[PDB]
Amino acid sequence: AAPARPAHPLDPLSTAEIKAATNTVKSYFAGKKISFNTVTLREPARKAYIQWKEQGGPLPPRLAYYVILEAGKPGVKEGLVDLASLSVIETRALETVQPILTVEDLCSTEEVIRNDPAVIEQCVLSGIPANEMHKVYCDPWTIGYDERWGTGKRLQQALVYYRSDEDDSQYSHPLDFCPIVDTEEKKVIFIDIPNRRRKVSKHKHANFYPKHMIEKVGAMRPEAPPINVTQPEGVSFKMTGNVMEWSNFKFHIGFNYREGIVLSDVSYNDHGNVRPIFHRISLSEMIVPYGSPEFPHQRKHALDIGEYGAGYMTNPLSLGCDCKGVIHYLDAHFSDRAGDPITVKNAVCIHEEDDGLLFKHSDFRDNFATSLVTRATKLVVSQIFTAANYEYCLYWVFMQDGAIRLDIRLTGILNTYILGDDEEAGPWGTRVYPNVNAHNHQHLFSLRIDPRIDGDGNSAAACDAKSSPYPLGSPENMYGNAFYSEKTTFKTVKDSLTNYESATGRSWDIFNPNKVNPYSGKPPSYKLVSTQCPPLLAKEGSLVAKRAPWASHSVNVVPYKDNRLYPSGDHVPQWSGDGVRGMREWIGDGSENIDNTDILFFHTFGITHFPAPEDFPLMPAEPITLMLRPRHFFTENPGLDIQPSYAMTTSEAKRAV
């Protein structure tokens, strides 16, 4: 009764595999009341995968990682199931952590608060009658961290809002108080109540559907005439299960509950020479730290990936109108609390689109009659997830010059808190609507790159543009114009801990010091070009800085070890930030070698958001991007064998008298 093996060792667990895993765990815990928090692929060891792929090695065993809760027991148990033998092969109890909050965990909280007498009383005081609790809503957040309870109970905090009508957007009407909910007992254990009470706003809700806009401004704009994009002869990409082949790239598209999209085993076919570039690339953690110091707002610093899961939160893309053209979809499969497989249909959208000019050059000599123009196509692998108020639109983009870009668009709704009639929002927030305070915050992301640049044994470096040190008027720099790129190769982990610097236009290289470009004499590399790299604004030693040790630097590079995925640790909710785990453990004392070995490159990037009224009641998409581009990887522009859209040589131009 063992489940069928996948097409490919990195494929996510099938529904049959998930059911097999949960059957096995229920049997192992026979007679105990357990509930499933996470059931997900435990990916093969890096060595095992690579030997299977390239050296005729054995197929790695199919393993399931699980996290469960047991009625009446603190914390969690976790372990591994060997799927071929239907057996639990590793197990341990962690009594003092709390795990990722699932959709089921969060879907239960509104009923809890609506029926709680102490919450009802606070609504009455706040100007909402006791019989109108159906109009009170909350966004159920991780408590994040609260030093009154630590990890001793599993807790949520309910950010409470009011709707006059169920079709309203509730965010114009936050209430003043914050219930704390025991997730497993399903009760309110405390309510944070501010010293200055602010009753519910009496303003109209700030709404945004067409029927609302017609009331607000009189009419919708006329429907614009259509801009139709078609691919009547299909696409150039080919999928074989989860394996993508496009413009010489080949890679595996994976997906899990936490990271969402995971791109693996990325190679480029350089005229028959298939060259590895990356073993794995994904987003591994986030943190969205808010900037109001007033209590209890310090508890808004969601680590969305580790506390809710970019997979668990992902939107089905069918009706989303962001997968246009001829597309390919992938589903995602998770477990529910009962241990049954659940599906998100069309979680991943794959499509190719026009990306402007790839390159062009014309000769002035014959008035540009000698000319070659080639248009670019990009391949886009995307998902969109919803983290209560916000939407994160993630686009992994492959390009025909061999570069890879991550484009993010942020949209959805500002998180809001109540503002008194006479209360000033600034300097920690903006009054984006009457009685609405949209607090300042950052959105920060931890990109995790496991490189294999042109094969094994890699290094990383900071690259800084510098004027020559010789002064103007010296024999060395007579006219003062000389400049160069200073490359600082990181020898130990400590050397790698570095920030973006505008003063040198810093970039970072990930390179293979065992190989040399036969033209330039430099090692083959991919260069990270990324300028949206905010400093972490929370202080050293703050709750934010402690729980996200990775976020303090733009770049952290540590040795590879299997299962080094998550840089705020494996179980993130309610960790105080004290202890050696995640990135803090990997960095250690900073002395380990990272030159010419198997490395892991974690990049912090994102934005700092000071809200303005343009962002409300629904925010226009805000862009974030970074690129990984080949430098000294190829010996020439690798797109030159793409047929031009137009080409005329000099001889041809002359012939056209």
Instruction: Rank residues 205 and 441 by Cβ distance to Cu ion and give the closer one.
Output: 441
79 binding partner (options a copy of itself, Cu ion, none; Cβ < 5 to 8 Å by kind)? none
**Would you say 415 or 574 has its CB closer to Cu ion?**
415
Active site residue 304: yes
Point out which span in 14-22, 30-38, 252-260, 433-441 binds a copy of itself (CB under 8 A): 433-441
Q: Which of 82, 168, 176, 304 is catalytic?
A: 304
Q: Which of 195, 196, 233, 589 binds a copy of itself (CB under 8 A)?
A: 233
Contact footprint for Cu ion (CB under 5 A): 609
| Active-site position among 65, 161, 290, 390 | 390
Identity of residue 17: E
If you search the block for the tokens 């803090």, which residue do you land on? Answer: 584
Q: Which residues contact 169 (CB under 8 A, 6 or more apart)?
A: 205, 206, 207, 208, 413, 617, 618
DSSP class per residue in 322-386? -S-SS-EEEEEEEE-TTS-EEEEEEEEEEEEEEEEEEEEEE-GGGTT-SEEEEEEEEEEEEEEEE
Within positions 381 to 400, which residues make up the interface with a copy of itself, using CB under 8 A? Answer: 384, 386, 388, 391, 393, 400
Restricting to residues 119-148, name those near a copy of itself by CB under 8 A: 133-134, 137
Whether 441 has a binding-site annotation, put simply, is yes
Q: Which residue from 89, 209, 338, 563 is in contact with a copy of itself, where contact means CB under 8 A? A: 209
- Binding of residue 585 to a copy of itself (CB under 8 A): no
Q: Does 584 bind a copy of itself (CB under 8 A)?
A: no
320 binding partner (options Cu ion, a copy of itself, none; Cβ < 5 to 8 Å by kind) = a copy of itself
Least Å distance, CB 312 to a copy of itself, is 11
Phi and psi angles of residue 299, each rounded to the nearest 5 degrees, phi first: -85, 5
Nearer to a copy of itself (CB atom), residue 72 or residue 210: 210
User: Within its chain, how far is the Cα of 70 from the centroid?
Assistant: 30
Q: How many residues bind a copy of itself (CB under 8 A)?
A: 182
* Residue 290 near a copy of itself by CB under 8 A: yes
Question: Parallel, antiparallel, or unpaired for β 178-182 and 555-559?
Answer: unpaired
The tally of CA atoms less than 13 A away on the side-chain side of residue 119 is 29
C-alpha distances in angstroms, 86 versus 31, 78, 338? 18, 16, 18
- Residue placing its CB nearer to a copy of itself in the complex, 591 or 646: 646
Name, in order, each residue with C-beta under 8 angstroms of 396's C-beta and a sequence gap of 6 or more: 261, 263, 380, 381, 382, 404, 405, 406
CA angle 600/602/606 to nearest 5° reads 165
Longest distance between any two alpha carbons in the chain, whole Å = 91
Per the structure block, which two tokens stand in for 330?
């992938």
> Using CB under 8 A, which of the segments 39-47, 79-87, 352-360, 590-598 binds a copy of itself?
352-360
Q: Contact between 578 and a copy of itself (CB under 8 A)? A: no
407 assigned ligand-binding residue: no
Q: Which of 108, 269, 514, 596 binds a copy of itself (CB under 8 A)?
A: 108
Is 290 labeled as catalytic in the residue annotation? no
Nearest to 19 by CA among 339, 463, 402: 339
* Shortest spacing between CB 152 and a copy of itself, in angstroms: 20
Q: Is 456 annotated as a binding residue?
A: no
Beta-bridge partners for 351: 380
CB of 343 to Cu ion, least distance (A): 31
Q: Give the residue numbers marked as catalytic.
A: 304, 390
